[PDB]
Design a protein around this ligand. Structure first.
Ligand code: CL
Ligand code: CL
Ligand code: CL
Ligand code: NA
Lengths: 194, 246
């Protein structure tokens, strides 16, 4: 129950339920907006439209499909089916689908930078940034070295999106120059002279 | 955000504390709900309250003692919880209508609850801010600051950036998930990073002050503390860097 698409492509998710219902409803959940009702279809309907969403209902073998056209990054979320009986006492969620929508990076510029040491910290901190969305950041393979996953950052002031990951350690043999080498590094990664 | 008002967003408790989860809506809705959700699972229905009737789907309802003083409130009264009760607790309401067909549900923000067996494992974060790379500035005319919050337990932090006294969201990316500092231990402490990226011109001004502040949710005043180290209460932990001229 995990679906990963590129921004702009279609997303189709399915769900099934076990009992008779009055209606079925799809929900979206993320930390950006919480758990949100998307669309409601009655057991006597077969298909419904609302914006970029269309839901199908096949009561015959108790299944529903949700299709999102022209997916955007914001659609990244968990999707769940809830079924409900008249009166509200049996509104029940079923198995969910996790949807990841990768945003396109128009101006990639992959680079590894060393940040300035903090006077209040013993850590050295490295930044891998501006790589395109095809790059995956591998976790740390050493005990006292920490590497985050990628985070997509929107500089709305410049209409500029960029990916980045952070690595750090207080060990004396840690080096920004190879901190991210357990990843597949784009051949055009910039390692500026300090 | 939402018209279903649920507090608190985060809660850490021991096995002997008593605490209420508040849920309120003023939409005139006629059914209210509690669900719980364990990580990577669907919400599981606990309670419904509608037209004077509490419906119970929870196996241990005495731990949660729901109460509705009126149709606008459905509060949970927590007592004698176990660590396995750690979950996201979600309140909702539904209008129903006049013949009960309008069963769509509106959710509140949820309470992320951790029940800790040993309160001596609770630790607030250390917070540090790291200044942008001069090489990034030279190559991109942009400047990425990094904030690290480390060593905290359990995982209930809210990180924000404050520039010259006002909170900033534009140009910020905070990790969706924390790192376990020791991924092979059940009680590992956590780390979280955040980036703030600004134009180089904004960073290269010594009068601009950049603060990373982390709200940690920990022990409350009704939690007993007998250790020598400082009580790990709910608290803000801050770090700050000033801009640096070219
Ligand atoms: Cl009435
Ligand atoms: Cl009532
Ligand atoms: Cl101690
Ligand atoms: Na891309």
């Amino acid at each position: 129950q995990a679906l990963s698409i590129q921004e702009g492509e279609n997303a189709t998710m399915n769900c099934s339920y076990k009992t008779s219902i009055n209606n079925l409803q799809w929900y979206r959940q993320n930390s950006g907006r919480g758990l949100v009702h998307l669309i409601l279809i009655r057991s006597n309907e077969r298909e419904k439209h609302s914006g970029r969403l269309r839901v199908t209902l096949d009561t015959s073998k108790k299944s529903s499909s949700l299709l999102i056209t022209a997916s955007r990054a914001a659609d990244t979320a968990s999707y769940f089916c809830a079924t409900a009986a008249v009166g509200g006492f049996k509104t029940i969620f079923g198995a969910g689908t996790r949807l990841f929508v990768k945003a396109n990076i128009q101006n990639p510029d992959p680079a590894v930078y060393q940040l300035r040491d903090s006077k209040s910290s013993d850590k050295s901190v490295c930044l891998f940034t501006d790589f395109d969305s095809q790059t995956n950041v591998s976790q740390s393979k050493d005990s006292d070295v920490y590497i985050t996953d990628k985070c997509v950052l929107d500089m709305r002031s410049m209409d500029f999106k960029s990916n980045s990951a952070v690595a750090w350690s207080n060990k004396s043999d840690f080096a920004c120059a190879n901190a991210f080498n357990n990843s597949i590094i784009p051949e055009d990664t910039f390692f500026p002279s300090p | 955000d939402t018209e279903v008002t649920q507090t608190p967003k985060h809660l850490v408790m021991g096995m002997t504390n008593k605490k209420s989860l508040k849920c309120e809506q003023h939409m005139g809705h006629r059914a209210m709900y509690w669900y719980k959700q364990k990580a990577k699972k669907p919400p599981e229905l606990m309670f419904v309250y509608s037209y004077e009737k509490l419906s119970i789907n929870e196996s241990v309802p005495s731990r949660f003692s729901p109460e509705s003083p009126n149709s606008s409130l459905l509060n949970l009264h927590l007592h004698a919880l176990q660590p396995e009760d750690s979950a996201l607790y979600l309140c909702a309401s539904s209008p129903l209508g006049r013949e009960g067909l309008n069963t769509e549900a509106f959710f509140g923000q949820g309470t992320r609850l951790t029940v800790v067996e040993d309160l001596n494992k609770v630790f607030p974060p250390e917070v540090a801010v790291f200044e942008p790379s001069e090489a990034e500035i030279s190559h991109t005319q942009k400047a990425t600051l990094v904030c690290l919050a480390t060593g905290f337990y359990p995982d209930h932090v809210e990180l924000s950036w404050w520039v010259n006294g006002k909170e900033v969201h534009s140009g910020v990316c905070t990790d969706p998930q924390p790192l376990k500092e020791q991924p092979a231990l059940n009680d590992s402490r956590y780390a979280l990073s955040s980036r703030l990226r600004v134009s180089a011109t904004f960073w290269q001004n010594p009068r601009n002050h950049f603060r990373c502040q982390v709200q940690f949710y920990g022990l409350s005043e009704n939690d007993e503390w007998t250790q020598d180290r400082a009580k790990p209460v709910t608290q803000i932990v801050s770090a700050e860097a000033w801009g640096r001229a070219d």
